[PDB]
Design an enzyme around this catalytic site. Structure first.
Site, mmCIF file in Angstrom:
data_model
loop_
_atom_site.group_PDB
_atom_site.id
_atom_site.type_symbol
_atom_site.label_atom_id
_atom_site.label_comp_id
_atom_site.label_asym_id
_atom_site.label_seq_id
_atom_site.Cartn_x
_atom_site.Cartn_y
_atom_site.Cartn_z
ATOM 1 N N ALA A 1 0.820 -1.208 0.000
ATOM 2 C CA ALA A 1 0.000 0.000 0.000
ATOM 3 C C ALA A 1 0.856 1.261 0.000
ATOM 4 O O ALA A 1 0.551 2.225 -0.713
ATOM 5 C CB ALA A 1 -0.941 0.002 1.204
ATOM 6 N N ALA B 1 9.151 1.244 8.753
ATOM 7 C CA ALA B 1 9.680 0.494 9.889
ATOM 8 C C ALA B 1 9.548 -1.005 9.646
ATOM 9 O O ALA B 1 10.492 -1.763 9.859
ATOM 10 C CB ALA B 1 8.966 0.887 11.172
ATOM 11 N N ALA C 1 -3.711 -12.103 -5.445
ATOM 12 C CA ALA C 1 -4.404 -12.026 -6.722
ATOM 13 C C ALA C 1 -5.014 -10.642 -6.911
ATOM 14 O O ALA C 1 -5.203 -9.884 -5.954
ATOM 15 C CB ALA C 1 -5.492 -13.099 -6.816
ATOM 16 N N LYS D 1 -4.073 -14.703 -13.955
ATOM 17 C CA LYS D 1 -5.320 -15.077 -13.297
ATOM 18 C C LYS D 1 -6.479 -14.808 -14.250
ATOM 19 O O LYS D 1 -6.779 -13.649 -14.558
ATOM 20 C CB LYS D 1 -5.505 -14.308 -11.991
ATOM 21 C CG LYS D 1 -6.839 -14.561 -11.327
ATOM 22 C CD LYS D 1 -7.053 -13.641 -10.141
ATOM 23 C CE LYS D 1 -8.514 -13.649 -9.716
ATOM 24 N NZ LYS D 1 -8.778 -12.751 -8.556
ATOM 25 N N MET E 1 8.304 5.115 14.093
ATOM 26 C CA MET E 1 7.690 6.402 14.395
ATOM 27 C C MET E 1 7.556 6.547 15.906
ATOM 28 O O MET E 1 6.842 5.769 16.548
ATOM 29 C CB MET E 1 6.326 6.533 13.722
ATOM 30 C CG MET E 1 5.663 7.878 13.956
ATOM 31 S SD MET E 1 4.047 8.000 13.173
ATOM 32 C CE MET E 1 3.138 6.740 14.067
ATOM 33 N N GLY F 1 -8.164 -6.690 -2.294
ATOM 34 C CA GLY F 1 -7.179 -5.950 -1.526
ATOM 35 C C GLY F 1 -6.393 -4.928 -2.326
ATOM 36 O O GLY F 1 -6.412 -3.737 -2.003
ATOM 37 N N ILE F 2 -5.691 -5.381 -3.367
ATOM 38 C CA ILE F 2 -4.964 -4.454 -4.233
ATOM 39 C C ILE F 2 -5.932 -3.478 -4.892
ATOM 40 O O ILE F 2 -5.614 -2.298 -5.083
ATOM 41 C CB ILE F 2 -4.142 -5.228 -5.283
ATOM 42 C CG1 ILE F 2 -3.146 -6.171 -4.608
ATOM 43 C CG2 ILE F 2 -3.400 -4.263 -6.204
ATOM 44 C CD1 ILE F 2 -2.092 -5.459 -3.796
HETATM 45 N N1 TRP Z 1 -14.938 -5.407 -11.986
HETATM 46 C C1 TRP Z 1 -14.377 -6.753 -12.042
HETATM 47 C C2 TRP Z 1 -15.412 -7.775 -11.558
HETATM 48 C C3 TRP Z 1 -14.987 -9.229 -11.579
HETATM 49 C C4 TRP Z 1 -15.372 -10.178 -12.477
HETATM 50 N N2 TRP Z 1 -14.811 -11.395 -12.158
HETATM 51 C C5 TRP Z 1 -14.048 -11.250 -11.030
HETATM 52 C C6 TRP Z 1 -13.287 -12.190 -10.331
HETATM 53 C C7 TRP Z 1 -12.612 -11.758 -9.219
HETATM 54 C C8 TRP Z 1 -12.684 -10.425 -8.793
HETATM 55 C C9 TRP Z 1 -13.438 -9.489 -9.489
HETATM 56 C C10 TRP Z 1 -14.138 -9.900 -10.630
HETATM 57 C C11 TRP Z 1 -13.912 -7.064 -13.460
HETATM 58 O O1 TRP Z 1 -14.710 -7.280 -14.372
HETATM 59 O O2 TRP Z 1 -12.713 -7.099 -13.730
#
Ligand code: TRP
Length: 521
Positions: A15, A38, A43, A72, A190, A353-354
């Site tokens: 992040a 410090a 996927a 993926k 910090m 997450g990302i």
């Molecule tokens: N906005 C995402 C929605 C999505 C479709 N399949 C997914 C599988 C995993 C996570 C998100 C998605 C996209 O089309 O790219």
């Protein structure tokens, strides 16, 4: 005059360095940026390239080889409909294996009606028993064949995202932000957070004596939330009443890819008291059992996790992590903006997450403040973050709520949790045959501009992937289709085209292993 001059980022994982790189490219030499600092696999979603790495000018051929990144095509849900132990392989139900896919992309339409609704019409008509994902997505056959999402020379084939090692990505971006974007890296912890009379943070003090002064501060300190929660005293909304999972045990396992290739998808494997991820990369895969402490003991989960992968629990390095599920009441308070785990967290069921970080970073530049810090800018930002999180939170909970499993106390208790009113409406609509959040643009616009996807992140295809994947089908097809029989007859050519694409993709695409070896070799 009133522009922000200095930005200080607390935290140096994924992040922090995604924030440092993106803001440094956006703001140029007009702002001094300083970061105070410090793998079990991660996927992503397809927008990561166009929103983030393309903004930095980084082609996939450059950043992927430096983070052991892999492809993926979907999330594959395993054993979410059948009872039994936590095992890696799918059980058999109705002659087929108990698995279904959630691919990327947008479903085609005929007569402004998504292909899913023609599949539902044919299921109700009794002329087909094919699963929804295999009838409407050509990606399903490619993933079964363990294909790469592209030909070796780069020719595109299917919509894809990425698996990678989060630590290696953070290190790549640190080496990018500091060597190319004039971001200053400061080691150490910090000591204290300096605040003025209005409560605005004025500097971060290190353990050496140094003040890291700035006008805007980015809290990327993870679950600790050292700025937004501890310093700014912003309360955290615990949402584990709705999503019962709050723990994980995780590790890396070396994998002989020459035996059965490298799966081009994240697996989500149902367990007795939660679910396990599997994140394949070249030579190894990351895996983690996400479970609810209220239904499984630590040693139970640990042993269930090791038993599924044939691991010796006494001689296996394991990450034991406790989760904070929920979000801050506000992501942005005064001149402190939380990004990443410092802001919110959901179990990685649909790999957000990302995306939550990328989206918070994009929305930050859209509402970027000056030293006045107009309340409308942070109010609008907080609403976008809040609506983005709650929508995905409800979506993830529907995976458990709609699953038909009642064999364990965990799976059964998910059916006893309060269903949010908006998800109740979506299920009632789906049962009446309606589409849910059908896409209004083509796939090029959807993935081309981030604001188009942000305003409709979980489309109709996704709700059908999960609902129909878990065995829930509409009570009846879309009523208008019974008035448009020529549409039904014409739309069958779309199913024959998917079958055509499935044959050529399996027959001509290279294996996912072949592409990874060309990319990393
Ligand atoms: N906005 C995402 C929605 C999505 C479709 N399949 C997914 C599988 C995993 C996570 C998100 C998605 C996209 O089309 O790219």
């Amino acid at each position: 005059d009133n522009r922000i001059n200095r930005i200080v980022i607390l935290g140096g994982g994924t992040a922090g360095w995604m924030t440092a790189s993106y803001l440094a490219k956006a703001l140029g030499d007009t702002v001094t940026i300083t970061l105070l600092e410090a793998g079990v696999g991660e996927a992503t979603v397809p927008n990561l390239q166009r929103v983030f790495f393309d903004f930095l000018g980084l082609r996939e051929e450059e950043w992927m080889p430096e983070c052991n990144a892999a492809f993926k095509t979907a999330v594959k849900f395993i054993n979410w409909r059948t009872p039994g132990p936590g095992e890696a392989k799918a059980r058999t139900i109705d002659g087929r294996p108990d698995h279904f896919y959630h691919p990327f992309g947008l479903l085609p339409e005929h007569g402004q009606v998504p292909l899913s609704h023609y599949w539902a019409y044919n299921r109700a008509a009794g002329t087909t028993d094919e699963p929804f994902d295999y009838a409407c997505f050509a990606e399903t056959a490619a993933m079964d064949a363990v294909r790469a999402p592209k030909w070796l020379d780069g020719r595109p084939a299917t919509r894809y995202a990425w698996h990678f090692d989060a630590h290696l990505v953070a290190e790549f971006l640190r080496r990018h932000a500091t060597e190319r974007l004039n971001v200053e890296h400061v080691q150490g912890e910090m000591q204290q957070v300096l605040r003025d009379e209005r409560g605005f943070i004025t500097a971060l003090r290190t353990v050496e004596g140094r003040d890291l002064e700035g006008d805007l501060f980015i809290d990327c300190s993870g679950f600790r939330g050292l700025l937004i929660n501890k310093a700014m005293e912003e309360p955290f909304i615990d949402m584990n009443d709705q999503l019962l999972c709050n723990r994980a045990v995780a590790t890396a396992i070396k994998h002989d890819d020459d035996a059965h290739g490298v799966e081009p998808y994240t697996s989500a494997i149902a367990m007795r008291s939660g679910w396990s991820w599997k994140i394949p990369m070249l030579g190894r895969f990351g895996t983690g059992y996400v479970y609810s402490s209220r239904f499984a003991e630590k040693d139970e989960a640990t042993l269930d996790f090791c038993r599924m992968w044939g691991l010796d629990p006494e001689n296996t390095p394991l990450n034991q992590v406790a989760f904070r599920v929920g979000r801050n009441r506000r992501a942005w308070v005064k001149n402190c903006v939380s990004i990443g785990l410092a802001s919110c967290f959901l179990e990685p069921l649909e790999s957000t997450g990302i995306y939550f970080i990328t989206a918070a970073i994009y929305q930050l530049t859209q509402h970027f403040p000056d030293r006045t810090f107009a309340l409308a800018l942070s109010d609008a930002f907080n609403h976008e973050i809040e609506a983005m999180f709650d929508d995905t939170r409800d979506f993830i909970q529907a995976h458990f709520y709609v699953s038909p499993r009642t064999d364990t106390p965990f799976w059964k208790a998910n059916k006893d949790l309060h269903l949010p009113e908006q998800m109740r409406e979506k299920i009632a609509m789906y049962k009446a045959g309606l589409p849910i959040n059908a896409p209004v643009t083509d796939e090029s616009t959807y993935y081309g501009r981030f604001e188009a996807e942000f305003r409709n992140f979980w489309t109709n295809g996704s709700y059908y992937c999960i609902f129909a994947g878990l065995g829930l089908r509409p009570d009846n097809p879309l009523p208008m289709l019974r008035h448009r029989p020529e549409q039904v007859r014409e739309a069958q050519a779309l199913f024959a085209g998917v079958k055509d694409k499935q044959r050529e993709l399996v027959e001509t695409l290279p294996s996912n292993l072949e592409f990874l070896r060309s990319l990393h070799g």
